[PDB]
Amino acid sequence: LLYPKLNQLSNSINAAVAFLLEARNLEGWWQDFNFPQAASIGDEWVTAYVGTMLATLPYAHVHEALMQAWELLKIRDHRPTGEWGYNYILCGDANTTGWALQLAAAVGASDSERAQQARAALATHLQPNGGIATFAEESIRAYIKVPDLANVSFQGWCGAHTCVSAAVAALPEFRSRLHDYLRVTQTSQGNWEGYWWSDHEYTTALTAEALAAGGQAADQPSIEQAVAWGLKRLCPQGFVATSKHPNGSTFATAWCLRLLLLNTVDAEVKAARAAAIGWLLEQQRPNGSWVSSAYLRIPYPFDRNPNQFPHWRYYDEIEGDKRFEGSIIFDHNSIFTTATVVNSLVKAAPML
Numbered sequence: 001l002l003y004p005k006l007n008q009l010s011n012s013i014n015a016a017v018a019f020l021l022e023a024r025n026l027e028g029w030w031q032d033f034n035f036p037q038a039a040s041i042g043d044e045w046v047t048a049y050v051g052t053m054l055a056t057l058p059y060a061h062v063h064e065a066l067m068q069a070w071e072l073l074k075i076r077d078h079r080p081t082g083e084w085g086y087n088y089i090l091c092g093d094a095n096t097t098g099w100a101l102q103l104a105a106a107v108g109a110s111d112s113e114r115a116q117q118a119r120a121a122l123a124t125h126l127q128p129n130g131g132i133a134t135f136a137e138e139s140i141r142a143y144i145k146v147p148d149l150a151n152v153s154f155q156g157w158c159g160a161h162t163c164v165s166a167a168v169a170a171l172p173e174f175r176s177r178l179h180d181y182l183r184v185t186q187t188s189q190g191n192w193e194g195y196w197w198s199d200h201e202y203t204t205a206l207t208a209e210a211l212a213a214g215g216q217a218a219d220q221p222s223i224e225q226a227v228a229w230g231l232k233r234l235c236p237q238g239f240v241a242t243s244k245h246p247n248g249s250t251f252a253t254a255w256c257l258r259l260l261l262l263n264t265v266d267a268e269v270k271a272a273r274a275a276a277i278g279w280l281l282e283q284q285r286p287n288g289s290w291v292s293s294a295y296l297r298i299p300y301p302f303d304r305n306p307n308q309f310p311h312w313r314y315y316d317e318i319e320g321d322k323r324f325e326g327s328i329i330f331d332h333n334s335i336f337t338t339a340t341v342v343n344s345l346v347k348a349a350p351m352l
């Protein structure tokens with residue numbers, strides 16, 4: 001054990017926590033992502049996610065931030081279902097709601113009236129194939145006012161999503177119901193593929209973590225297959241390479257590091273986690289953040305298979321006329337990425 005690397009982990013994590021606490025707005029929300037001149041900036045979703053990421057820290061001032069985040073979420077009580085959504089102006093969705101419920105658990109509010117209502121609302125999103133859909137069709141159609149989408153299918157946006165199902169399966173009340181859907185959707189390579197996210201490491205880590213949390217020995221082979229895939233994704237330099245970031249994605253690497261924590265005996269896995277930690281420490285910016293790489297894609301509403309859509313473009317790079325469908329957006333404030341990385345480092349440090 002190299003005590004300088006443990007102390008650098010402490011310093012890295014503290015710098016990121018300071019960045020994230022200072023990056024809150026007037027009322028205390030974490031904000032990220034932007035649909036310009038349209039749905040605008042994420043808050044309820046980003047806050048639920050960041051707060052859940054930071055729940056792994058022992059710090060009293062972080063717990064106070066999470067208590068405040070929950071109070072902000074409780075004041076967002078305008079939707080009749082009790083759901084949370086991307087931000088105030090959006091309808092509820094199952095992903096935001098599932099992350100908000102993980103934050104509720106961290107602050108002792110899982111059995112609150114609001115949490116019970118929101119958990120009930122998740123049940124509406126259960127599909128006949130055993131997974132969870134992001135949106136209710138009537139709700140998201142009521143929000144969208146784009147003429148060339150008025151008459152299209154919304155079965156892409158309103159079908160079962162593996163990324164959302166994996167997150168909801170972090171809740172003990174849903175883990176058993178979502179199990180068979182999570183098992184049947186694993187690829188022959190050992191990973192899972194999400195709907196909204198470009199980086200499969202996110203869905204793979206979350207799904208493997210839900211299977212691990214259920215404690216069924218029948219799921220252990222699937223978990224180990226996912227770990228093996230993670231080991232192949234992480235190159236020797238300690239990062240996950242992508243087409244967009246061929247020298248390493250901070251977001252994809254952080255989620256791959258979380259996935260590799262699911263095997264604590266294999267020496268090659270332990271070495272790969274060490275390499276990922278070293279690369280993430282090298283990549284941190286002076287202000288404590290990491291470079292944005294949390295790529296969210298917007299399929300067409302009818303598209304059930306966005307991993308089979310070859311046309312993705314980065315919204316911010318499109319010259320001339322453009323639309324959100326078929327584009328990728330990112331976390332312009334680096335809050336979503338930074339919270340992800342800091343969580344992975346806190347979880348990985350004791351297994352150094």
Ligand SMILES: CC(C)=CCC/C(C)=C/CC/C(C)=C/CC/C(C)=C/Cc1cc(C(=O)O)cc(O)c1O
Pocket residue numbers: 035038039040045085086090093095096134144145146149164196296298324325
């Ligand atoms: C599910 C998840 C990963 C996070 C939980 C939060 C969610 C829901 C993240 C996904 C991305 C989505 C759909 C976010 C909502 C906002 C929106 C509907 C964006 C597209 C858009 C807007 C408009 C418009 O605002 O007019 C017109 C569009 O044609 C159009 O595609």
